[PDB]
Every structure is written in C-alpha cells, then in structure tokens.
Design a protein around this ligand. Structure first.
Ligand code: QPV
Ligand code: QPV
Lengths: 377, 376
C-alpha cells in the first residue's frame, strides 16, 4: 500500500476521490458564474458579471476538497474571462476581486493560478449514482466552457484513463519491495500486471472517439484550455491584479500535466526528463503544475533503485520480456496519442484559411520509449 | 541521524569528506593535464595535449571518491579545452578521446558532462595537515585554471560556507521528529539552533573579500566556470564527439547548484521552486546538477509534512519567532550574496553582465522576506 502522504487513491489513483460539487453559500456568486459560462459568454455578460463580484475571502474554504472545487471554479471563470467568446477579443488583466483569492488559494495548494489538468480532469467529476461503478455512463463533469465544446468527453475519457492507470500505480510498491528482497518471480509477476493495466488504459482511451468531435475540440475547447506562456495573444503573460506587480506566464492545461503521463516512464528508467532537450524540460516543468504530493511521488520514484538496471543486469529472458511488455504498453499509448493529435488537431488545422510541435514532442517521447526496449517490438 | 543513502557527512554536510587527490596510474595522462592547466593553457599546449590523449576506459575507477576525482579532473580539462585562454577563442567540439569517458562517467554518477559545484567545490579540497581543523589556513584546492584566478579563495570560501551549514543540516531530523511527536519545546530549540548555524554561515561568507580580487574573478575565473546554455559564444551547445551526434546545452558552475542554497528554503516551506518564473525554473533545473543522493534528500524534505504549516497552525508566538529567526538568517544570506555580485560582477563589468543573477537573487530574497510569519 502506497503512503497517504502522496494522495494516491487505491481506486482512482491521482484523481481526487468523490470530488465536492457545491461550495459554501458564501461563494454562491462564484458558483453561478462557473455553472453558466456557456450562457454568460454567449450573452456577452460574463466579463460584466465577474467585474461586479466582491472580493471574497478564501477562509471559508475549510478542507482540501472545498479548496480544490474553488480552484476549479476560479480556474474556469479565469479562462472564460481571459478568452471571452474565443475569437481574439482577450483580457490581459484578471480583476483583483477574482485574482487575489485565486492566487491566495493557488499559493495554499502549491499550484499555479491557471486551470490545470488536476482541476479540469482530476477534480471536475461526479458519479451520477454513487452506488453504481466508475464507468462513462455513470459519470459527468462539473463544469464546461461552451455549448457543444465536448468538455465532458475530453475530460471524462482523460479521467477514465487516469482511473484505469490506478490499477498499475498500486503495483509500484511490490516492484521496489521485490527488487529489495531479490524476489525475481514476484518482480516478473508485478511487471506483467503493470503491462496488463497499461493495456487496459489504452482500451479505455479508445472511448474518446464516441464523445469528442474534431471541429468542436480544435475550434472551441482548445481555445479555453490555452495558457499565457509563449502565446502571442498575451505576449507578457496575465496580470493578476493586486497580487503581483508584473504579468506572469503559465502554460495551459494538457495531458503532459497528468502524473501517469510520466510516472511509468520514471518507474521504468525511460529517461524522458534527463538531458534530452525540449521534451525532457517540458515534462520536468509540468511537474510544477501537478499537486505537490503528486510531484513528490515522481521524485520519490527517482530516489529508489533503478528497475531498468535491475532487469538489465540479471540475464533473465522472462524478466526482460516482462519489463518490455510495460515499455511496449507505453509505446502503444504514445502511438494512440499521436493518432488523436492527427484527428483532433492536425486535420482541423489544415482545413482553414497545426499541432506540429505536439506531434514532434510525442514522436520524441515515443522514440525514447521504443529505444528503451531490451528487444525490438 | 540522516540516512546513509543521502551522502550527508556530519562534519562537512554535502561536501565530499576527505576527497581523493590521486587517481590510479592508468589515468596519469589525465592527471598531468589537470595538474598543469595554468602552464598548459598559457603556452597554448592544453588543446593539443587533450587531442593527443588515447581514449581511456572508465572501468579502472573502482570507488565513488575515484569517480568524483575523475569528474573533477575531466571537468577542469573540459572547461580549459572549451574556453582556451579565456579571451573568446572557443572550441565547439570536445574530442571523443576525452568526451566519451567523461560522458560515460557522468552517466554513471547521474551528473551532466560539465564542471558543476559538486566537482569544483565539494570534491576539490584537502587539508594541509590532517590533525588541524577545517580552516582556510589549513586548506587547499586540488585544481585551478590560471595563475592569479583566485580559484582557491572562491572555491574554499564556498566550501567553508557549505561546511558551516552542515551544523544546521544535522538538526533537520530533530525538526521532523519533534513535529511528529508533538514536541513544541524541542521544535523551538531546533529552529533556534538552525538560525544560529545560518547566522554563523553568514559570518564565514565574509571571508570572500580576503581571498578573491574582483578583477581576477570577473575577467578570469568567471570565464572558466561558464557553461554553454544560452551562451552566444556556443549558441547550440557543445558537441560531445562520439557520444551524442548533436550539440548539447548545459549550465555553468554556480552557487545555485549548492544543496544548502535551497535545502533550508525547502525545510521552511519557502516555495522557491513553485510557480513558473525564472527563479523557480532555475532552482528546480539545478537539482539535476547536484549529486543524485543530494537531489533525493531535497525530494525527501518535500515529502515530509510542512514546518511552516505546523508553526502557523499552533498560535504560538515563541514558535513563530524561532521560525522567523531562520527566515531572517536566509534573507541576510541572500542580501550578502547580492552585495558580492555587485562587487565581483556588476562593478567590474562596468569598467570593461550580472543583471540576470541579481534579479534571480532579488526574487529569491523577496520570496524569503514574504515568508515571515510575525503574528498569528
Ligand atoms: C486536459 C485533458 C487533456 N487530455 C488529452 O489531451 C487527451 C489525452 C488523455 C490521456 C493521455 N494519456 C496518455 O497518453 C498516457 C501516456 C502514458 C501512460 C498513460 Cl497511463 C497514459 C493523453 C492524452 C484526451 C484525448 C487526448
Ligand atoms: C562555484 C562556487 C560558487 N560560489 C559563489 O558563487 C559564492 C557563493 C557561495 C555561497 C553562497 N551561498 C549562499 O548564499 C547560501 C544561501 C542560503 C543558505 C546558505 Cl547556507 C548559503 C552563495 C554564493 C562565493 C562568492 C559567491
């Protein structure tokens, strides 16, 4: 069993178990705006409604789940405020009434004041029926940006992959214990179980096609998830009015912020974040957009003995094959993500008057992964 | 006591205790070049002597101290080779004979193939007399670049600050044990002891003025410690011939690579690595330039519950005061480092940069000053 200091759930992994849906009544003015972003954006009243808020104190957010919900609420409001209708009419100053409590709450949780994956996927969900299991039909998201944005599909399928990967995460202690104890058969079994779980995560990933259409994702949802780091539309970043003097740059929400997007690479010694230029640096930087317990889990994995060096040394075909099943499962996931980038970004981008950087990043990550196979796939 | 897996010595902290001076006879050709850099650089013989080397296997470097000495040797040779006489005539390719074993050894130790703080400060020292204490008068460096470079003063004063901070490092287990056991008075005493040890480290820092000349530092030593990451002189990085096909960028040696430069910020919950600014980015990136045991120690500190959170939760003026004493000691250290950069970089740069380092340190100082609790 993994230690409770890492905030990894047995069932849902890095996802926030049973997220809070309602804030205390003190924050009803926040909740109305966040729950009606589609309507307020279309009516041209979103920015007016945000600007007419009073500066609410964060002190009535007493527990972690209420603080995580408030982050999700404030993050969604912030994206809507900055991006507006999503056609270039932007705002480069986040008003103090929202910016101050958002930044205070963000400092408390050690997350940047921008909507991250941990907000819009890991905390942005509920069970419809609490007695029925974690399947797509028994689940919903808490917040969307626009009507027809496919945020439900995009977020929930991401979450279901995250939950599928939780079955692999719980085997990680067995791997390190087996290595410490020199329990070859136990280690072999653990690696095969991880491979099996990552294969199941890929099958869960296939559900994306049923719940997201390309036009909607590319032209709508991708706009609202965009950040203000190296972005021509907010060249200097965003001014958080009354908290920081200078504008601050933060990257937008993405799958690179998922802890499972790199924890198995780290486990297996696939040196994604080691001296491999841009891709490495990006994966390292995205740790600062994860909850602090989850980033600490990643560096804690790095402090343990190398799984790769254990397998490489042992002259054991069964063990090398079990390691390779895990590495191949990761290759297959990268390949599927590359297919998704083609369908949902490249093709829609070509049909205009695309996401080539993301394609090249995934090709580099896949190449590093494939090259860590002990035998060719 | 701190666990042995973190490679923290009770006396010298993150410094390598009693570093090795001589390699095996197999590496005499490396040792000769490293021991004669002042003469070989000045005469224009360094680069040809490196280029004439046979590619030596790293497999005869049997222990950790031998591998660390070899890193120090190869690191110093590499800086000398890249920068030459330090007048801007640069080498863009490091030849395979040196590059391959340096990159191999670097991969084995999990450090980048460039001279880091852990090489040129933490492993680059000896006592003159083993029976006498760790003082400047009883100490020497193992390698320098040029005659008059003030490498002794710059490296050893950095080391002596590092050693002074070791007295605070050994209190860290007492801090976390006292929090776990709910031992208020033990925690208060531990925080006051850390503040005192950091105050003492500041007084040790004052010796820099006695042993380093601004002109010599700026015009010579700073040049040899420079890396090839965002450096216009090697815009694409350095080619490590026969290891990687494409050139690779790595940052140069600096105090930002010292584990004490951030472990007390981490201990006290001063979120230096949080957010997406330059300072947060830099401090996190510099953990990859620390020895793996030391980066693991920093990770372990962050995995433990927050000292800041504990002190703030208690409504205890005595405990807040002892916490603030540590924060104040850090502010003073940052302020002192700023004064050094003004004297040793900014003023010499004005008399034929430094501004990026100053802004980094001002951000770090401001973040530290904002962490003061005062009332509660
Ligand atoms: C803000 C949500 C971003 N969501 C995505 O961008 C999508 C996605 C989801 C999940 C992943 N995850 C992996 O590829 C992976 C890699 C390694 C190991 C594991 Cl377990 C998983 C990638 C993209 C959903 C459609 C594209
Ligand atoms: C390659 C050596 C680089 N050496 C320096 O650049 C100098 C130096 C030394 C030490 C420090 N250390 C701190 O400022 C500090 C901060 C927080 C906690 C502690 Cl214990 C210490 C900074 C610069 C020496 C003259 C400038």
């Amino acid at each position: 069993m993994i230690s409770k200091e890492y905030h990894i759930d047995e069932e849902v992994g890095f996802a926030l178990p049973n997220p809070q849906e309602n804030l205390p009544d003190f924050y009803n003015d926040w909740m109305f705006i966040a729950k009606h972003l589609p309507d307020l954006i279309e009516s041209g009243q979103l920015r007016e409604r945000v600007e007419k808020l009073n500066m609410l104190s964060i002190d009535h957010l007493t527990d972690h789940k209420s603080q995580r919900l408030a982050r999700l609420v404030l993050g969604c409001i912030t994206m809507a405020y900055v991006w507006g209708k999503g056609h270039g009419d932007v705002r480069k100053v986040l008003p103090r009434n929202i910016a101050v409590p958002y930044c205070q709450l963000s400092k408390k949780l050690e997350l940047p004041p921008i909507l991250v994956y941990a907000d819009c996927v890991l905390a942005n969900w509920k069970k419809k029926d609490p007695n029925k299991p974690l399947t797509y039909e028994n689940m919903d998201v808490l917040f969307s940006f626009r009507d027809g944005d496919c945020s439900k599909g995009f977020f929930l399928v991401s979450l279901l992959v995250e939950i599928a990967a939780a079955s692999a995460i719980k085997v990680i202690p067995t791997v390190f214990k087996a290595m410490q104890m020199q329990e070859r058969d136990t280690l072999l079994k653990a690696l095969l179980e991880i491979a099996s779980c990552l294969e199941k995560a890929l099958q869960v990933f296939h559900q994306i096609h049923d719940h997201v259409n390309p036009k909607a994702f590319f032209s709508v949802l991708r706009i609202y998830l965009s950040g203000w780091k190296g972005n021509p539309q907010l060249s200097d970043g965003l001014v958080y009015e009354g908290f920081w003097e200078d504008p601050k740059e933060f990257a937008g929400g993405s799958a690179g912020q998922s802890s499972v997007f790199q924890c198995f690479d780290v486990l297996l010694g696939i040196q994604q974040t080691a001296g491999g230029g841009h891709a490495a640096q990006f994966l390292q930087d995205m740790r600062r957009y994860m909850p602090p317990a989850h980033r600490n889990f990643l560096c804690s994995l790095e402090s343990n003995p190398s799984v790769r060096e254990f397998v490489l040394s042992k002259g054991d075909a069964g063990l090398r094959e079990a390691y390779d099943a895990c590495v191949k499962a990761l290759v297959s996931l990268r390949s599927y993500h590359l297919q998704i980038v083609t369908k949902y970004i490249l093709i829609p981008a070509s049909q205009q008057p695309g996401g080539t950087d993301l394609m090249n990043f995934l090709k580099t990550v896949r190449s590093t992964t494939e090259k860590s196979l002990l035998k060719e796939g």
